[PDB]
RNA sequence: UAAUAACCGCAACAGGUCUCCAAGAAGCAAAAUCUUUAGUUAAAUAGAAUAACGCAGGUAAGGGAAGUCGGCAACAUAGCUCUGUAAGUUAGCAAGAAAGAGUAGCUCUGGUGAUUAUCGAAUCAGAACUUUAAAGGUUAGGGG
RNA sequence: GUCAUCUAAUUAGUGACGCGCAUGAAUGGAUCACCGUGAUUCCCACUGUCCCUAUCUGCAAUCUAGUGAAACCACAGUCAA
RNA sequence: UGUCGGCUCUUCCUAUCCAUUUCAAGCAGAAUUGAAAAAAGGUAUGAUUGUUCACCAUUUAAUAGGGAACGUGAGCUGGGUUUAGACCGUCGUGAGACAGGUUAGUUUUACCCUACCGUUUCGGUAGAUUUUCAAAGUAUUUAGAUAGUAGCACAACUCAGUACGAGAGGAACCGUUGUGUCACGCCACUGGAUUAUUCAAUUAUUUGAUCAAAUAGUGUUGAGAAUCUAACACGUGUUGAAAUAAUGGCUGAAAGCCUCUCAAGCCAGAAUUUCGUCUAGAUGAAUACUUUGUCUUUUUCUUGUUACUUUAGUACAAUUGAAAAU
RNA sequence: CUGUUGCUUAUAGACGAUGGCAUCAGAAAUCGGUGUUGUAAGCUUUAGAGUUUCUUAAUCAAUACUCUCGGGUAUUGAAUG
């Protein structure tokens, strides 16, 4: 579903860690299990940063979508990274949003900003995205 | 570029950016400025800030 | 038993043992493979290491999705000073490797090159080369280096020109020059032989070994560190916060029945003060000239290569220097031995030209603002000590 | 002498051994911390360098028990005042439940008495102004 | 053990069923309010436990001047078959 | 001879899970299945259980199987088992028994030799006499017998919605761009530690009050240069030549034909081998100065070496030793 | 020649070792650059809520104005002279 490459972003959410949801799917927060496209190493924790593609599960939200595991994507974090150009530069708080494997977005709307690195990475993200950092 | 609480000038590749939920985004020259920053003190009160070079003198 | 689960291995094996050098000066094991068919030239040179600071670079490769304003990049700055060639040795391939056959040295030689024949100099009597230089114009000893010389044209399949620096143009409180066996791969040994005889006292400058762009390997020693534990030499993992007799070491060195230490243990010792060549280095700025100074032509500020206060624990650079992108092996002040690549790069990144927007000349103490000291005191202004 | 050297422990042993007299600050406090009278500066040797591994005390970007048999160890709450407090119950409790707000400095105002205007006690409440917005130097409950 | 429930995932916990190898009534049966440096599970908060290690201080360790033991010791001390 | 498991770490086997090179299919494509070369590289995160084992939820190119005194307790832990307290169930008249369950139970010593890792000291390698030479001493520049060896993997674009196939579906070669990890570094940019008790503020005690400090074994807080550092910052390992294993072929007999050869002779073909590159490295070589010029030993001076000093003794230029290949 | 020794020597370092200089040796301040923190002490702005005391002068008064981009520190492993 993504599109093109993406570049080093320093992955500072870990796995077990608690995001928020900007979509508006009736789930509030998001707890990190697995990242897509990890590749494994001995007693390394699974990593995610801006515009990465993870396996989450709610156990904050509406019935049909607590207890679950879904498929979200990291719009912004905490984390400080640097772009290629120079430029340093990190969120207020660790969000995402509910996606699948073709990437079509779930909800409709994104509430703040999302990262470029998300962005560009799924169009989708992008067109519901209301301003892109 | 210039710092959102010292006001000074920052330099190419240097400082961080700050973007706060409100989609306002503030590029800072050092911590010295951001720790400030984040504790809402007043620019026009610190001394050696840019900002009170202007309004005084 | 088997492990239970598959790790790579911590360390490279490659580089035992961990040996700390002797010399400072760093020996490059190797040359690029010679060609007879181009015209004679030096393959290397010596520079040191002033320190280093960041450019911001315009792209011009195609196909990637850099931006456009200009990629961030650190640069090392390697100052130098023009060489003085005092000799010339030729090489020969026996079944025992190469054995040098003569070595033909130039009639005036300074001071800086008869230190390195003495430990101390004070106390020497300062008589190194002495008859070599009041006998050089007699007959016999004319007829003997044409001898030397025509022997190398005979004997002969490799040809080095023992080259020096100049300790009087550097910030270092050394005085003794350093050395270096420069080799001149070219055309036939005849004329490598000629090209030899027409560098003798003639000082060589860095634009006339390396070009522009262009990609050379560098062989330097590493910052020394001294006794060093498992942790740190290896990278081996902490153990938990209730073993007893300590955290910091590997836990079984070895299983029983073999019942000595393997070698491949990972064991405390020196880290530190090593010999580490690093290949593909591209050239980004040739600082010889017009190209002396900071300045580029997005940014026409006229500024020396010296950050503010100077760089750190090294003084000013005021001779020739190279841009090299990247970091090399070693602190300030380290020897540095350049020498073109042996394995040309044919990557479109190495081939690709570059055009440098921004050279970052700040003070690299603390958090600084400016880039030059006559536009610090522009923007602060008059100050109260200066009325 | 009556004990970190006179007593018992093989010793000038960080263990043990019954009592009397007892200043100031601060605080609810014979608490922690600092000082006065008195005592002492020596109580199994020092100097140089400032490697690894240790013993004792610490801090940390993003994540927050994913480590581990197990939140083991550490972190965290913590004083006082006002509001407010559940199921359950042997009807006494649970209960400091849980949860929320306030606290500094300077300048003032009022209340609580004795003797016929003066004399005296810290305690409570209130109001402007100012600042780095205030229990937290020490002491000081994690909760369900 | 089987069924619910707790978790993304439950040889764990809780609640049910009971021909229960081999429960059961002052060898006491059932029932817990308050209490416990008692045993077990789950939540919020917090954090170097961990991802993954970095760094600081004191005391040693290192070297030196004085002083100065002990366990142990058939003889000793490089490997492959 | 310290008796389970787990943690840390190294190495070995192939009866190979992945990546590389091949052959076969009831192999159109895609996905697969059977087999050969090959052990140089990689092979994960968690709920429950002391568990090995097991069973689940993921991620991955793959989440292969085993050994090393059932590797590894003067390496750790003490969860289990496996003393001494106590409870229950069954058995026994009773003391007591239970590969039945439950809870609580001290984990000692390396300063010795060797192995391994690093680090000093001393000793030293024989055929050579074109003085434009030869040897010893000191110092520099180089040399490289041997030993180790390092780079892998994935993804995106284009090829291409193309080949193939009725449709559904659906690749690959070259090229380009990044990411992850491992290894080596490094201090520019960003972050962390911070007794420069740096600068500032401030609680308590003591300096008659201000200034300026001290004490609270670093009082505390905010900012905080230097130095170190990042799994948190960033660079390099995109690198060339030949010969090969499995296999596919060329010419070609045996065996008039056929055949890649259990024949002679060749070619192409791997994450392979060797050069090339990197690290350590022995005997060494060249040059500079001090010497010496048939030779030695015992003393002896020096921190030590060489030349040097005394008494000797010994020899004194002149027929030896080469075809190569088959 | 080499070693000891000196620079309480460094690009090095457990100790040796290693690297540099040794009379044009070295060290030291001071000065300028370069950094860190945030405006020093003294007198003035009735800054200033208010209470006193003359009587509508004063005094005391958190904090704040000018001198002040001030003062202090800065190799100790910074850089000129």
Not at chain 1, 14 to 23: E, F, G, H, P
Not at chain 1, 108 to 121: N, Q, R
Not at chain 3, 183 to 210: C, P, R, T, Y
Not at chain 3, 234 to 261: D, E, M, Q, S
């Given at each position: ?37 990890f ?24 019935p049909?979508?607590?207890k ?13 990274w ?34 470029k ?17 | ?57 | ?26 020996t ?111 007959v ?15 004997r ?23 050395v ?48 060093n ?134 003070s ?7 880039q ?14 200066d009325?």
């Amino acid at each position: 579903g993504r599109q093109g490459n993406k570049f080093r972003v320093t992955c500072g959410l870990n796995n077990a860690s608690t995001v928020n949801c900007a979509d508006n799917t009736g789930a509030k927060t998001l707890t990190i299990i697995s990242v897509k496209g990890f590749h494994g190493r001995l007693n390394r924790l699974p990593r995610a940063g801006c515009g990465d593609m993870v396996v989450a599960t709610c156990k904050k939200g509406k019935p049909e979508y607590r207890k679950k595991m879904h498929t979200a994507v990291i719009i912004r974090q905490r984390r400080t990274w640097r772009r290629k150009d120079g430029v340093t530069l990190y969120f207020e708080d660790n969000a995402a949003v509910i996606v699948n494997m073709k990437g079509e977005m779930k909800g409709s709307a994104i509430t703040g900003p999302v990262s470029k690195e998300s962005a560009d990475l799924w169009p989708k993200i992008s067109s519901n995205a209301p301003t892109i950092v | 570029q210039v710092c959102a609480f010292s006001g000074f000038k920052i330099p190419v590749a240097k400082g961080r950016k700050y973007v706060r939920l409100d989609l306002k985004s503030f590029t800072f020259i050092n911590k010295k400025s951001l720790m400030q920053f984040l504790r809402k003190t007043n620019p026009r009160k610190v001394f050696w800030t840019a900002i009170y070079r202007q309004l005084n003198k | 038993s088997h492990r239970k689960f598959e790790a790579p291995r911590h360390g490279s094996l490659a580089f035992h043992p961990r040996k700390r050098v002797h010399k400072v000066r760093a020996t490059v094991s190797a040359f690029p493979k010679d060609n007879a068919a181009e015209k004679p030239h030096l393959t290397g040179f010596l520079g040191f290491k002033a320190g280093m600071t960041h450019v911001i670079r315009e792209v011009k490769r195609t196909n990637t999705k850099l931006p456009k304003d200009g990629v961030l990049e650190p640069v090392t700055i390697i100052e130098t000073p023009p060489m003085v060639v005092a000799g010339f040795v030729g090489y020969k391939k026996t079944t025992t490797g190469l054995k040098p056959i003569t070595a033909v040295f130039a009639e005036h030689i300074a001071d800086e090159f008869k230190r390195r024949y003495t430990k101390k100099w004070y106390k020497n009597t300062k008589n190194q080369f002495a008859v070599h230089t009041e006998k050089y114009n007699d007959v016999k000893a004319k007829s003997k280096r044409e001898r030397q010389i025509r022997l190398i044209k005979n004997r002969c399949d490799v040809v080095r020109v023992i080259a020096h620096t100049q300790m009087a143009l550097v910030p270092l409180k050394q005085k003794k020059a350093e050395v270096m066996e420069i080799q001149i791969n070219g055309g036939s040994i005849a004329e490598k032989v000629d090209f030899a005889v027409s560098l003798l006292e003639k000082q060589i400058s860095v634009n006339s070994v390396f070009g522009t762009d262009e990609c050379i390997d560098v062989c330097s020693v590493t910052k020394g560190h001294g006794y060093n534990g498992v942790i740190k030499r290896f990278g081996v993992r902490h153990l938990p916060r209730k073993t007893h007799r300590g955290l910091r070491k590997v836990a079984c060195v070895g299983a029983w029945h073999p019942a000595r230490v393997s070698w491949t243990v990972a064991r405390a010792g020196q880290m530190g003060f090593f010999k580490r060549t690093e290949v593909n280095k591209k050239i980004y700025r040739l600082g010889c000239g017009d190209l002396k100074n900071a300045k580029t032509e997005f940014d026409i500020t006229e500024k020396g290569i010296t950050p503010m206060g100077g760089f750190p624990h090294y003084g000013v650079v005021k001779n020739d220097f190279l841009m090299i992108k990247g970091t090399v092996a070693g602190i300030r002040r380290r020897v540095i031995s350049l020498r073109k690549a042996c394995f040309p790069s044919t990557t479109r990144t190495a081939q690709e030209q570059i055009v440098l927007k921004f050279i970052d000349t700040s003070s690299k103490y603390g958090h600084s603002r400016f880039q030059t000291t006559t536009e610090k005191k522009a923007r602060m202004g008059p100050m109260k000590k200066d009325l």
